[PDB]
Design a protein around this ligand. Structure first.
Ligand SMILES: C[C@]12CC[C@H]3c4ccc(OS(=O)(=O)O)cc4CC[C@@H]3[C@@H]1CCC2=O
Ligand SMILES: N[C@@H](CCC(=O)N[C@@H](CS)C(=O)NCC(=O)O)C(=O)O
Length: 1329
């Protein structure tokens, strides 16, 4: 080895000894170090054995022949020391190669990465020797030609995939296809033609499905708890081994990327040095291209590994949380807010998956800094210390800022949750709000919290501006400090391109690890507390099934059993004993808080058994007090997974008297009942629950007050056909918690208790004869138009200022780098450069302008986003409130809420950041291309083909990824939606013993989410590789055209072009990523303005024909030929209600009774009618005016969240004395004075704390405080009170009354009867009879 032939001569030939030693030791050596390690994978991972195919044999036979040929050399040598050891070593490694394909066949691997890279390395080594041997010119040469031809054919064979031993093609994908991710390209094509749906999505890998990952974590956590508990131990014990490879991949990727600046150094030396061989530059550019491609492949395999591991972590955590929820104790379940348990899978699971892809940064960010610093130390020297100072002045600050960001993020979710719930209260109750005309206040109420939001979003915007400044300017800031110090401390400190641009490249390579390090640390610390929460959920006590002896088929046996609701709380059921025989009806009897429901909970192993013995025999069907309804159809609610039996189902439905409920419901039993679908009354929910229990056909039934909400006739019918001895459950052991005596004599056994203690149980007649506790009990009683629209929403001046500042930034950066190229071209004079202070001053001024302009650019667009979010929320609120209630009933509340939630969040927190990042990446790519073109114009021919290659990759990915990012977001909500359902009905899940079914359903939901998430991450890793190679071949091309024209280009220009080509690599990938994110997030801005053009209500205030202050002078109502639609519900209505005359409206279901009120409040428009109050037409008056001058007490009053005073008057227009007087007149003074908060009592959503009677009296208080002459009543215990109050002082005012009860309407004169919209009778009740 001497530079005489390997470097100096224009023919770069390797020496003969080098050829025969190192070029042969490289490949043989590769297989020797990998062979042992490869058994680990081959053994731990198995897939069967591949059959005997021609390909496998062809490879094995060539491996035998290759070994022979290599040993044939040893034979001829036997017939120089290197002529013995080298052929034998090659033969032995060849014998290891053929044995390896053999064992790979045995272990079922179709595509072999080792048997592809090994042949590639051998081929390259053979190629080098081949060229040398063909340039030298029989004896030993022909053996090498045979070896090379066989190696080439072996390499070609190794590319094809062997036979296998809508599934994901990844399993059958070749290594060439598993490194380029070519197997997803089909979806990239398919997503371009046919929009994707869930069926097209590939099935999850068997090692990736929840059915496999979750039991691993469950088993490992069980082992860890049995050992002692730390969730981190299990987390890095189960997912650690697969996550290990990401480390090797990240280390190799770091080394490969650092190799780039070294090759740039060598290329700058070559260009700067004439009289050098021309092949040296070509070798350097080929090496740079190879290094860039290898770095791309290794890096993207690393992320694939990280992203798969994070997804597995999320799946396992979600499954473990779901399975632990069904075993958790009541005490513990209540300790953690239900919403908190949903958050465990909503955020904690997500945060883990998001963080996993970057855990390796904690070890590689410092490495990419330390190695870069060493590299910088090789170029500049001690001056690099100044650069370190900049890091000490940057990385900490960002970290602090990063933490603050998270804080503000939390505060954001403080206000977001503060509004969405309020928005729900607005969305559930639009009828009452429109009638009470508080639309404008709530608008401001809602608007107030948005302003509070922006108070927090603007703080986050200041932080985000600091973050983009500290990210994009980080490479320059370090470069400026280090260059200034380097050129100032020493006068002989020459600055050549080699010692500047290479360093500059390093600064681009220290941009990423430097600023992601803080973020990641932040994402670690936050994840840390999330982890603790998970541990808190996974260390909670379990409910031992042995507590209740569940013997398969004296039916229920309890002796000396005391139960608790908690370990430390006192017993709720003290010393209970009773024996319920098979097929007997037992009624639990007691007062409120006695312990009746606790008995049924104890029989289900829900109570904590401190002592005793319970021996419930056979399956148990639980009808809980609080009915649990699944969001599935009513048929599947009753079925509860069990097979459908038409005769049994049709015997169960009417026996529960569910036939009228089926009739009223739109789709019958196929209607979507539950919270999300159609809402059901409490009695209907109890029926469904009872019907589900009856269909389940258990032997033991625990009916915790099934007849609480059903009416007396319906309850008696139900007991007759279901629970009674002559019903459906005649032979079933039925336990019924009741407080109604009507069915007590039919009960076989009455268990009457007091204070959680058995108190003289027995049969009804015997208990009555005994005259004890039971007697006492009885005696008790996308086009661009949307981008233009968002640009308008931001503000045209702000947007154009942001564009101007961005252009200034990129021009400044490009000009500063060109200035550096000129500065490095200053000829050394006597060991210095004449222009050092001037050049450095220009560089510093340009960069200071660049930094301040970056700060301005980020801040400007951030403020524009704030403004756009403000205006968009104002527009959405105004349009929603202006829309009539027909729109409100038509559109599901889900999409109306989605307009305000999870979509405003994208507009206000994602779109500004994503647009900043997109614009930055796009103009960085444009600037790099411009610099390369300026340096080497001949590279222009490169632009079309690669551009074409870009275009398709730009066209295919963005079309497909969007769908993948929608479908995923489609399946994420049900996973939590199921879990919530599971959490609400845990007792019902355990009582029916259907834990496995719900566990499998949750696993299916999670797999549905992952079947869209996995294609998304693989799409990212496919797009990444595609764009990288394009940015990689331009690095090779820029370098190649620099080498071609080295006689005219200075070293500085070459280094500048190569460095910009190095960074355009990551810039192109980030460009398209953010381009797809633009469409996905700008669809939200499009959907925000989905109601701006819909039909709105009549103007609230006309102000041209406004009525006088006392508009209802007497309250003379006149329906003059009224006709209301939504063919005509109201028709031919010509009636006159005199001022201060009580009038009621009677009619059956389907008449226009209620629709008549809708006529008074102009909620809908008159198809044909001229309703006039006094001497003024209603249709001419603005809505608010009439809605303010007329009052309505609806069917169900809505108590909005807030204080009682804001309920009675949000406009706070009426004085406190008026509020007090109205509340006293509403029979509410005693109660309203009782709250500690006086008038400021904080009532929850819908007034859950208040009783129904109270809420009704609060609505009456609202109507009374209004003090209007026209009042409407909608009638459905407190009826006596509300009727008396409406008859007390409102006699002066004209009252219309729509009551489903004739008793109250009889009191009111002038009754109007509506048969089918027509006026059937118009006169006083005296004339009625
Ligand atoms: C670190 C990051 C990768 C890319 C980053 C980036 C890239 C270019 C950029 O501006 S650019 O002008 O250089 O295009 C800004 C940023 C800001 C932060 C942004 C991400 C936050 C989380 C993440 O994975
Ligand atoms: N220089 C980076 C290149 C990798 C990269 O893609 N960086 C960012 C984006 S600029 C990232 O992690 N993206 C992951 C993704 O594509 O989701 C490194 O060393 O990791």
């Amino acid at each position: 080895w001497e530079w005489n032939v390997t470097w100096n001569t224009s023919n770069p030939d390797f020496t003969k000894c080098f050829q025969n030693t190192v070029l042969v030791w490289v490949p043989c050596s590769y297989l020797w170090v990998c062979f042992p390690f490869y058994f680990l994978y081959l053994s731990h991972h198995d897939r069967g054995y591949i059959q005997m195919t021609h390909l496998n044999k062809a490879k094995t036979a060539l491996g035998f022949l290759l070994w022979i040929v290599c040993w044939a050399d040893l034979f001829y040598s036997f017939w120089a020391p290197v002529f013995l050891v080298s052929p034998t070593l090659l033969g032995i490694t060849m014998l290891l190669a053929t044995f390896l394909i053999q064992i790979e066949r045995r272990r079922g691997v179709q595509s072999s990465g080792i048997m592809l890279t090994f042949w590639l390395i051998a081929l390259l080594c053979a190629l080098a020797i081949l060229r040398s041997k063909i340039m030298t010119a029989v004896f030993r040469d022909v053996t090498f030609y045979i070896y090379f031809s066989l190696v080439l054919i072996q390499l070609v064979l190794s590319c094809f995939s062997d036979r296998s031993p809508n599934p994901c093609p990844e399993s059958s994908a070749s290594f060439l296809s598993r490194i380029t991710f070519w197997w997803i390209t089909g979806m990239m094509v398919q997503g371009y033609r046919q929009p994707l749906e869930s069926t097209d999505l590939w099935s999850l890998n068997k090692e990736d499905t929840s059915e496999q990952v979750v039991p691993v974590l469950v088993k490992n956590w069980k082992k860890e708890c049995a050992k002692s508990p730390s969730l981190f131990k299990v987390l890095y014990k189960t997912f650690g081994p697969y996550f290990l490879m990401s480390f090797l991949f990240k280390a190799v990727h770091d080394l490969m990327m650092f190799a780039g600046p070294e090759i740039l150094k060598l290329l700058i030396n070559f260009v700067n040095d004439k009289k050098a061989p021309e092949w040296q530059g070509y070798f350097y550019t080929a090496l740079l291209f190879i290094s860039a491609c290898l770095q791309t492949l290794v890096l993207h395999q690393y992320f694939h590994i990280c992203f798969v591991s994070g997804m597995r972590i999320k799946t396992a955590v979600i499954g473990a949380v779901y399975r632990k929820a069904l075993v958790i104790t009541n005490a513990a379940r209540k300790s953690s807010t239900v919403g908190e348990i949903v958050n465990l899978m909503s955020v904690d699971a997500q945060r883990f998956m998001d963080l996993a892809t970057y855990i390796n940064m904690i070890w590689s960010a410092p490495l990419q800094v330390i190695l870069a610093l060493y590299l910088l130390w090789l170029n500049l020297g001690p001056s690099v210390l100044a650069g370190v100072a900049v890091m000490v002045l940057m990385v900490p600050l960002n970290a602090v800022m990063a933490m603050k960001t998270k804080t503000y993020q939390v505060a954001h979710m403080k206000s977001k949750d503060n509004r969405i719930k309020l928005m729900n209260e607005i969305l559930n109750g639009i009828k009452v709000l429109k009638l009470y005309a508080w639309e404008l206040a709530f608008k401001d109420k809602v608007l107030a919290i948005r302003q509070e939001e922006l108070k927090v979003l603007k703080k986050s915007a200041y932080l985000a501006a600091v973050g983009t400044f500290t990210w994009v300017c980080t490479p320059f800031l370090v470069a400026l400090s280090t260059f200034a110090v380097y050129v100032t401390v020493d006068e002989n400190n020459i600055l050549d391109a080699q010692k500047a641009f290479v360093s500059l490249a390093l600064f681009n390579i220290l941009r990423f690890p430097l600023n992601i390090l803080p973020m990641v640390i932040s994402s670690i610390v936050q994840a840390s507390v999330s982890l603790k929460r998970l541990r808190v959920f996974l260390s909670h006590e379990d409910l031992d099934p042995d507590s209740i002896q569940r013997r398969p088929i004296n039916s229920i046996t309890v002796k000396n059993a005391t139960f608790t609701w908690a370990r430390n709380d006192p017993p709720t059921l003290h010393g209970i004993t009773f024996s319920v025989p098979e097929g007997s009806l037992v009624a639990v009897v007691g007062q409120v808080g006695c312990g009746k429901s606790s008995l049924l909970s104890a029989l289900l192993a829900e109570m904590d058994k401190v002592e005793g013995h319970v021996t419930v025999k056979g399956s148990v069907a639980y009808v809980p007090q609080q009915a649990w309804i699944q969001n599935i159809s009513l048929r599947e609610n009753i079925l509860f997974g069990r097979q459908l039996q038409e005769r049994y189902y049709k015997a169960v439905v009417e026996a529960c008297a569910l036939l009228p409920d089926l009739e009223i419901l739109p789709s019958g039993d196929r209607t979507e009942i539950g919270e999300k679908g159609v809402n059901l009354s409490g009695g209907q929910k109890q029926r469904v629950s009872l019907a589900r229990a009856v269909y389940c056909d258990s032997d033991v039934y625990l009916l915790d007050d099934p007849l609480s909400a059903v009416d007396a006739h319906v309850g008696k019918h139900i007991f007759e056909n279901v629970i009674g001895p002559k019903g459906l459950l005649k032979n079933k052991t039925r336990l019924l918690v009741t407080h109604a005596i009507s069915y007590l004599p039919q009960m076989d056994v009455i268990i009457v208790m007091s204070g959680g203690k058995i108190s003289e149980m027995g049969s009804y007649q015997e208990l009555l004869a005994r005259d004890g506790a039971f007697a006492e009990f009885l005696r008790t009683y996308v086009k661009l138009s949307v981008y233009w629209d968002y640009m308008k929403a931001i503000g045209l001046f702000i947007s154009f200022l942001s564009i101007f500042l961005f252009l200034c930034n990129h021009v400044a950066s490009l000009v500063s780098n060109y200035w550096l190229s000129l500065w490095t071209d200053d000829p050394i004079v006597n060991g210095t450069q004449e222009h050092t202070q001037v050049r450095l001053s220009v560089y510093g001024a340009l960069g200071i302008s660049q930094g301040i302009t970056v700060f301005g650019y980020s801040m400007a667009v951030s403020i524009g986003g704030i403004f756009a979010s403000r205006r968009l929320h104002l527009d959405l609120l105004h349009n929603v409130l202006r829309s009539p209630i027909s729109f409100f009933e038509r559109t599901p509340s889900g999409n109306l809420v989605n307009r305000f939630s999870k979509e405003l969040d994208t507009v206000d927190s994602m779109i500004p950041q994503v647009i900043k990042m997109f614009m930055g990446s796009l103009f960085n790519v444009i600037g790099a291309c411009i610099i390369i073109l300026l340096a080497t114009p001949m590279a222009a021919v490169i632009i079309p083909p690669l551009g074409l290659i870009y275009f398709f990759v730009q066209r295919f990915y963005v079309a497909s990824s969007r769908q993948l990012k929608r479908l995923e977001s489609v399946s994420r909500s049900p996973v939590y939606s199921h879990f919530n359902e599971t959490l609400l009905g845990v007792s019902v899940i355990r009582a029916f013993e259907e834990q496995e079914r719900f566990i499998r359903q949750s696993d299916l939901k999670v797999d549905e989410n992952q079947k869209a998430y996995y294609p998304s991450i693989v799409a990212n890793r496919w797009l990444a590789v595609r764009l990288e190679c394009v940015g990689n071949c331009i690095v090779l091309f820029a370098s190649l055209f620099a080498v071609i024209s080295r006689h005219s280009l200075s070293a500085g220009l070459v280094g500048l072009s190569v460095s910009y080509s190095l960074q355009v690599t990551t810039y192109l990938n980030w460009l398209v990523r953010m381009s797809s994110e633009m469409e996905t997030n700008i669809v939200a801005v499009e959907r925000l303005k989905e109601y701006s053009e819909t039909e709105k209500e009549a103007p609230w205030q006309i102000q041209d024909m406004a009525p006088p202050k006392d508009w209802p002078q007497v309250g003379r109502v006149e329906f003059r030929d009224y006709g209301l639609r939504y063919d005509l519900v109201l028709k031919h209505i010509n009636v006159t209600i005199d001022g201060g005359e009580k009038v009621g409206i009677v009619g059956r279901t389907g008449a226009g009774k209620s629709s008549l009120t809708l006529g008074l409040f102009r909620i809908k428009e008159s198809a044909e009618g001229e309703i006039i109050i006094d001497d003024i037409n209603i249709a001419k008056i603005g809505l608010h005016d009439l809605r303010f001058k007329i009052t309505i007490i609806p069917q169900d009053p809505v108590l909005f969240s807030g204080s009682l005073r804001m309920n009675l008057d949000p406009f706070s227009q009426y004085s406190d004395e008026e509020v007090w007087t109205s509340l006293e007149l509403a029979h509410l003074k005693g109660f309203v004075s009782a709250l500690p908060d006086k008038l400021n009592h904080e009532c929850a959503e819908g007034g859950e704390n208040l009783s129904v009677g109270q809420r009704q009296l609060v609505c009456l208080a609202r109507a009374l405080l209004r003090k209007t002459k026209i009042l409407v009543l909608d009638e459905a215990e407190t009826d006596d009170l509300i009727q008396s109050t409406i008859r007390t002082q409102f006699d002066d005012c004209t009252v219309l009354t729509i009551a489903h009860r004739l008793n109250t309407i009889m009191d009111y004169t002038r009754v109007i009867v509506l048969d089918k919209g027509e006026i059937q009778e118009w006169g006083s009740p005296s004339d009625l009879l």
